[PDB]
């Protein structure tokens, strides 16, 4: 499929409602394993499991480890946009 | 998985 840029909304208070795996020592992108219902990324409609995250909010996670991915992403805040592609 |  192709790239698409999706926009999550959360309030400060809660998570972004992702599982990923994968990651650089894994030889795969991270990638989405679980939506949690209700949270931010199910909320947006457009992250879905299965995807790869590209990157998010300009960050690019295609060459980074799964910890550093994990860290970026928990850094996030507000109005975010994931970069993202279902291969 | 890591959860986020």
């Known amino acids: 499929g192709p790239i698409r840029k999706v926009l999550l909304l959360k309030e400060d208070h809660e998570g972004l409602g992702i599982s990923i795996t994968g990651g650089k020592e894994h030889g795969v992108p991270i990638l989405i394993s679980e939506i949690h219902p209700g949270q931010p990324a199910d909320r947006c409609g457009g992250l879905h499991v299965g995807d790869a995250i590209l990157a998010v909010n300009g960050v690019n996670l295609r060459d980074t480890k799964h910890k550093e991915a994990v860290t970026i992403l928990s850094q996030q805040r507000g109005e975010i946009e994931f970069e993202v592609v279902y291969v | ?4």
């Open chain 2, 1 to 4: 998985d890591s959860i986020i």
